[PDB]
Design a protein around this nucleic acid. Structure first.
Lengths: 103, 119, 89, 93, 43
RNA sequence: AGCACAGUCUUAACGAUGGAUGUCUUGGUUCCUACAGCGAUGAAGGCCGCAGCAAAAUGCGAUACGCAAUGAAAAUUGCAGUGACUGAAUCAUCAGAAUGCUGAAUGUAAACUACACCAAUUCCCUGGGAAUAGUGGUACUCCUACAGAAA
RNA sequence: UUUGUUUUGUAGCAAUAGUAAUUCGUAAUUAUCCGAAGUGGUAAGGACUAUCCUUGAAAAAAGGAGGGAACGGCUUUGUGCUUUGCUACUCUUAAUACUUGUAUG
RNA sequence: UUGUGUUGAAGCGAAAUACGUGAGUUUUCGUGGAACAUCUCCCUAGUGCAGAUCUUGGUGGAAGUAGCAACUAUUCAAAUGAGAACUUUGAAGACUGAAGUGGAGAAGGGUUUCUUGUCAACUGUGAUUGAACAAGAGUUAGCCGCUCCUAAGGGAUAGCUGAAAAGUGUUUAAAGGGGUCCCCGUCUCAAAAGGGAAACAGGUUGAUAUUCCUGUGCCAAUAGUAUUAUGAGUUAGAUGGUAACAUAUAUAUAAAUGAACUCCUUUACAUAGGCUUUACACUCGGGGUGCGUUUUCUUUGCACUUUACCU
RNA sequence: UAAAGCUAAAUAUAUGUAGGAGACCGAUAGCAAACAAGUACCGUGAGGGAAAGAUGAAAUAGUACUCAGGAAUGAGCAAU
RNA sequence: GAUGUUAGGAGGGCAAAUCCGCCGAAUUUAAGCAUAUAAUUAAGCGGAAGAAAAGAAAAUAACUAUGAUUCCUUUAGUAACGGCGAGUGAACAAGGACCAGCUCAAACGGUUAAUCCUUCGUUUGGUGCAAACCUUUCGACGGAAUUGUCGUU
C-alpha cells in the first residue's frame, strides 16, 4: 500500500496550523516576586478575537516594576470581564471574576 | 613609427604625455573612421603594438622603481615571493628533510658506509 | 477540458523553472529552490556521478581552456629557476 | 600586496571610443542642438561628464546614458544659452 | 519582455552579434545560424 | 515534304536520380615506454571581451589571433599597410612582464553589474601639482606567539 | 472701516498652447470660443446599516505626546561654579561669499 | 616465390563460337585514371545473405490522386514591375461593432523594430510582398519601475545528530545599533499587482519618449565661518472665543524652547446592501464656424464649438 | 613478545601528457566525433546527441569572349 | 578559558586509471525459491602519491629447521566452507624479482633544560649579467618547556 492520510498528517507540509492572523499565544503573566508575594493590577484595554479559537482574548497592560514602562499580555478572557477594569494577579489579590490567584 | 630603445629611457612624464596625445590621436582616427573616411585606419595595429611595447617597458620601469625600494628584507610581499607550485612550497626543505638525530649523525659521521672490492 | 492533457495545457507553459546558473552557464539553475540541477552551485562540490560517464566527460578537466595548467606544462622539462632569463646577445 | 604596473582604471582614453555619425546624431545637433558620443559599457554619467569637461570646454546641462545591444554605451550631452550648437557641429565634423 | 536583467540583455546582444554571416573577403579565401522564430536560444 | 494508333510489357545503346564499388587517409583503435598532480601566490570550470576590414574554430586578456627576451632568420598578404638591404617580417623556444568578471570564492547578496565598513586611495618630480564616488583590506575553522578585560 | 448696487474675467494657470472655417508672399491673419440644463454609464469619496463557530497581514518609514538633562551675551577674580560694569537679545525660512573631494541628483 | 601496371591497375556496364557441373574462373569492348595479383606452398580472420514487422541510406506504384472547406465578399481603374486575383494608390460594396484582428497591457520571445536594397530557398497558389535575405540604424529618467521594507516562506550562524553526505535551525547567543555607563537587538534573501520622496502640459523622430525639446514645477540631500533680511518670542518662549472652534498669507502660513526614558498614531487592510457628492462619460434645444436629395416639401438631412501638473 | 610509530626497492596504472610501434579499421568501418564534435539540435531538468572527407599535377589554370534571354541559365564558329 | 579587521601560517575546490577507508544492493545462478550465489561487487560518501597500502613477528613450522613487507611461478581448484545442493575456497613450505633497517616509553645531566621555536641586526665564502639561490654564525630579545625537550641507551 501507500502512506495513509493519518500518517501524512504528521509530516507537517500542508497540515500546519493556518495561523497567519492569530494575535499571539495565550499565556499568563510570568511568575515574579510581586505576583508571588502580593497583588499586581493590570488593566484589560481591549478584548479581541483570535481567529483560530472561539474564546476571546484580552489585552492586559501591566506596568513593569523593574523598569519604567508597560508590558502587554494576551490572556484568555473569562466570561464577564470588560475593557477598562483592573485585574489583579498574585497571592494577596482578592478573589473575583477574572482575577488570577494561586490555586 | 617608434621603437623600444628611443623611449626606453626618456622621462616618464613625457612618456605619459606622449601616450595621452597618442590616445587622443587614436580618438581622432576614431572620428575619422566614424566619418566616411577609412584611409588612415591600417596603422592603428602598429600604434597599438607600439603602445604595448612602451607599456611593457613602462611597467618594468615602475617595477624596479617599486622593488628597489624594498629589495631583500626577507618578508617579500604576496607577489614578490617565489611562485612555485603549492605542493613544492609546502614541501619540507631538502636540508631539513635530510636532517638526522644526533645518534644517527654520529654513527654515520664516525663510521660510514663505504665501497670495497672482492678478489 | 479546453486546457486539457495536451495542447491546451501546453499553451500555459510560460515562466521558467531553471535559469543560467552563473557557475556553469547552463539553463539548469532551479529558481524556486535556488540550486543548480547540473552542479549544485550553492554547494562547494561540483556534483558529478559515476553512473553517467557522458556527463563526466563533457565537463571534466580539459574540456575548457586551462588558463594555468597548460602554461605550467612543459616547464618540468626545462627546470628553469624562477626569475631566470636567457643570456643576452 | 603591492602592484607595480600602473592602474587599469578606465580614464577618458578607454571610456570614450568615438562619437556617433548616425543620421539621427547629426539631425539632433542640426535641429534641437544636442550632441552624441559613444563610450565603454563600464563608464558612468559623472565619468563621462568629467571626460567631456576635461577634453572640451562645453557646458553640460546634463549627461544622458544608454546601454546599446552591441556592448557599448551611448551618451548625450548639451549646452546652455551661452553656447550655440552649430560650431559644435562644424568643428568636430 | 521589455524589462530584463543586464546579463540577459548582454547575452541577447552577443547572440545577435553571433548570428551574422561570414565576411565576404574571408569567404573569398556559417553553419551556426539561428532564426529567432525557428530555434529558441533557451534563456 | 510524308510515315507511324495510343497505352502496358521486354531487350539494347545513351542519359537522369542516387551514392554503392574500387583506390585514397594530417583519423581512430590496441600495445609498449617515460613522466605526473593543480589551488587563497586564487585552481579546474563558466562567462565577457580582444584583429583594419573578423561570424565560428584556434589563440590571447584592456600590453588581449599577441608584448618582452633567446635561437632561426626576412616576409605578412585576400586588399590595406607594415618591414633588412638585423632585438625589425615570419616561425620556433618561452624563463621576464601582464594575465578582465567570476568560480573552493572567501565583506553582505544575486534572474540585482545592488549594498557595506576600515585605510579616502593612486600618480607625477625627488617638499610642490592632478584623477577622482576613484585603489587595497575585511568569510569560516584551525595552529603558533601577543594583548588588554575576568575568579 | 463694513454693508448693498453697477463695469472686468472663459476664479487665477487659460490662450497666447492646442483646435477649427474663409481670404491670403507661399508665410499670414481673422474672429469665434455661449445660456444653460438632462440621463446615470464608469470610477473615487463620504456617512450608514447588515453578516460571520469566517473578524478579514508586517515591517521599512514618518509624526504626536508625558517628563524634564540644558537655556540672555561681552570682559573680568579664584576654582563647569559665587562675584563686579553695560544690558540691547536668540532662534524658526530664504539665501549670499571663502576652506573640505568637486558639495546635486 | 614471381609477376602485371601511363603503351592504363583496381573498380564498373555490356558481352564471350571460352572453361567448369557449380559456386565461380578467364578474356573482349567501353568507361576508368593509380595501383594490383600470386593456384608455388603455408598462415590468419570482424571471410560468403533473400528474408530476422533486420539497421542505415536512397527510390517507387499509390498519384498529378486525397486534398489546398471554419472566420458572410468582393469589384472597377491606375502605378510599379519581365511577370500582378492575394504589392501600392483612388473609387465603390462591405466587415470587425461597444465583451473589437482598437489603444496601452504583464509572462514568454529577443531585434521579429526602423530605413534602404533585394528574391537562391521560405512565405503549402501567385508574389514585385513579408515577421524571409543583405547593409546600416534605433531603446536617453532625481520624478516610470527595479533597487528599500516585510509575508507565505528559502538559505545560512550557534549548536545537536550523522562515517560523511546531509537533517533541524537558539534546543544552556557572550549576537551590531543607540544615546552618554547602561538599554535594545541571529544574519541574509524572498513582491516590477502588497507598503513606498517627488512631473505635468504642449511639441519633436524614418524608428525613443510623461526619458528628447520648451515651459512650468515637485522631492530627497547639502560640512566649517561672515553678511543679510523676514517674522516670531523674548532683558527662558502668544491669541481670542460662555463653546465647540480657530489661531503667523514674509518671495513660502517658518518663526507658540527642549536630553535620557516610555506611550500612542499613520503606514494598516473583509464582505453585502442601498443613499449621497464629485469628476469623467453621454445627451438636449436655441447663439459662432461647413456639406446635401429636393420629380414632390422644408427656419430642410445633418456636421465642427477645449484647458494639465500648479492654490 | 600485542594493545605506540617511521621506512626506499621489487608491484599496479580503461587518467592526463609526450614518444614508438601493429598479420588492427579504411568514412554505414575505426572513438560519438578524420570536418567548425560532445558541435548543430532536442528535453523545464537530470540528461539525450548526430549528419557531414576526395576537382585538378597546378585554380599563382576555378571558366575569358560572343549570341539569345528580365534573370536564372542555354548555345557557340569561342575557351583553361 | 572568550575576544581580536594583532603578527606569521594552514584546511576548503578541481582532477581518479592505479591506491586507502566507510556505506552498500539488486539483476543473475540454484532450471522454482527463502540460506547460499551474484559480492565483501555496481551505485553513494570521504582521503593521498608518483606510486599508495603493507612492512620489521605477540610469524611459520615440528624440520638437519626458516627469519620484515610486497609481487611473480607453484602450493591449488588443494585443506576447507556450502538447502554439503548450485557453487565458493585459502594458508605453510619451495623456486625467483627486490632486499636497510630503524625510534618513541623508563636510567642517568638536578655542582645547573644540558633543550626547542620566534623576531631583529653583523659576517663565512660562492656559483648567476641580473633576479634570485647554496652556504655563514656573532649574537641579542621574546618566549615554549620540569604537567618533561634534548643528551643516554
Amino acid at each position: 500500500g501507500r502512506v495513509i492520510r493519518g500518517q501524512r498528517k504528521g509530516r507537517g507540509s500542508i497540515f500546519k496550523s493556518h495561523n497567519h492572523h492569530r494575535k499571539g499565544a495565550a499565556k499568563l503573566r510570568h511568575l515574579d516576586y510581586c505576583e508571588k508575594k502580593g497583588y499586581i493590577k493590570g488593566l484589560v484595554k481591549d478584548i479581541i478575537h483570535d481567529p483560530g479559537r472561539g474564546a476571546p482574548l484580552a489585552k492586559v497592560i501591566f506596568k513593569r516594576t523593574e523598569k519604567y514602562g508597560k508590558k502587554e499580555e494576551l490572556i484568555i478572557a473569562s466570561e464577564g470581564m470588560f475593557t477598562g477594569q483592573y485585574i489583579s494577579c498574585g497571592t494577596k489579590a482578592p478573589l473575583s471574576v477574572g482575577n488570577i490567584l494561586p490555586i | 613609427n617608434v621603437k623600444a630603445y628611443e623611449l626606453r629611457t626618456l622621462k616618464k612624464k613625457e612618456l605619459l604625455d606622449k601616450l595621452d596625445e597618442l590616445k587622443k590621436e587614436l580618438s581622432g582616427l576614431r572620428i575619422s573612421k566614424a566619418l566616411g573616411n577609412s584611409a588612415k585606419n591600417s596603422k592603428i595595429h602598429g600604434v597599438r603594438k607600439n603602445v604595448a611595447r612602451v607599456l611593457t617597458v613602462y611597467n618594468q620601469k615602475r617595477k624596479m622603481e617599486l622593488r628597489q625600494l624594498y629589495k631583500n628584507k626577507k618578508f617579500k610581499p604576496y607577489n614578490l615571493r617565489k611562485k612555485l607550485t603549492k605542493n613544492k612550497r609546502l614541501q619540507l626543505s631538502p636540508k631539513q628533510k635530510a636532517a638526522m638525530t644526533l645518534r644517527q649523525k654520529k654513527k654515520v659521521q664516525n663510521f660510514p658506509q663505504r665501497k670495497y672490492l672482492v678478489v | 477540458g479546453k486546457a486539457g492533457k495536451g495542447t491546451g495545457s501546453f499553451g500555459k507553459r510560460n515562466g521558467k523553472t531553471h535559469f543560467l546558473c552563473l557557475r556553469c552557464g547552463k539553463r539548469s539553475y532551479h529558481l524556486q529552490k535556488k540550486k543548480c540541477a547540473s552542479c549544485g552551485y550553492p554547494s562547494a562540490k561540483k556534483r558529478r556521478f559515476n553512473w553517467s560517464v557522458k556527463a563526466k566527460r563533457r565537463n571534466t578537466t580539459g574540456t575548457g581552456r586551462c588558463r594555468y595548467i597548460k602554461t605550467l606544462r612543459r616547464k618540468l622539462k626545462n627546470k628553469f629557476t624562477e626569475g631566470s632569463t636567457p643570456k643576452p646577445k | 600586496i603591492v602592484k607595480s604596473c600602473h592602474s587599469k582604471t578606465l580614464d577618458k582614453y578607454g571610456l570614450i571610443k568615438y562619437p556617433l555619425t548616425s543620421e539621427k546624431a547629426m539631425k539632433k545637433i542640426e535641429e534641437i542642438n544636442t550632441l552624441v558620443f559613444m563610450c565603454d559599457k563600464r563608464a558612468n554619467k559623472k565619468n563621462i561628464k568629467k571626460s567631456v569637461k576635461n577634453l572640451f570646454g562645453i557646458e553640460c546641462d546634463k549627461v544622458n546614458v544608454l546601454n546599446t545591444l552591441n556592448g557599448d554605451k551611448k551618451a548625450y550631452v548639451r549646452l546652455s544659452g551661452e553656447h550655440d550648437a552649430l560650431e559644435v557641429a562644424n568643428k568636430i565634423g | 519582455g521589455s524589462i530584463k536583467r543586464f546579463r540577459l540583455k548582454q547575452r541577447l546582444g552577443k547572440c545577435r552579434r553571433q548570428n551574422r554571416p561570414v565576411p565576404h573577403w574571408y569567404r573569398l579565401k556559417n553553419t551556426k545560424r539561428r532564426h529567432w522564430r525557428r530555434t529558441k536560444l533557451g534563456l
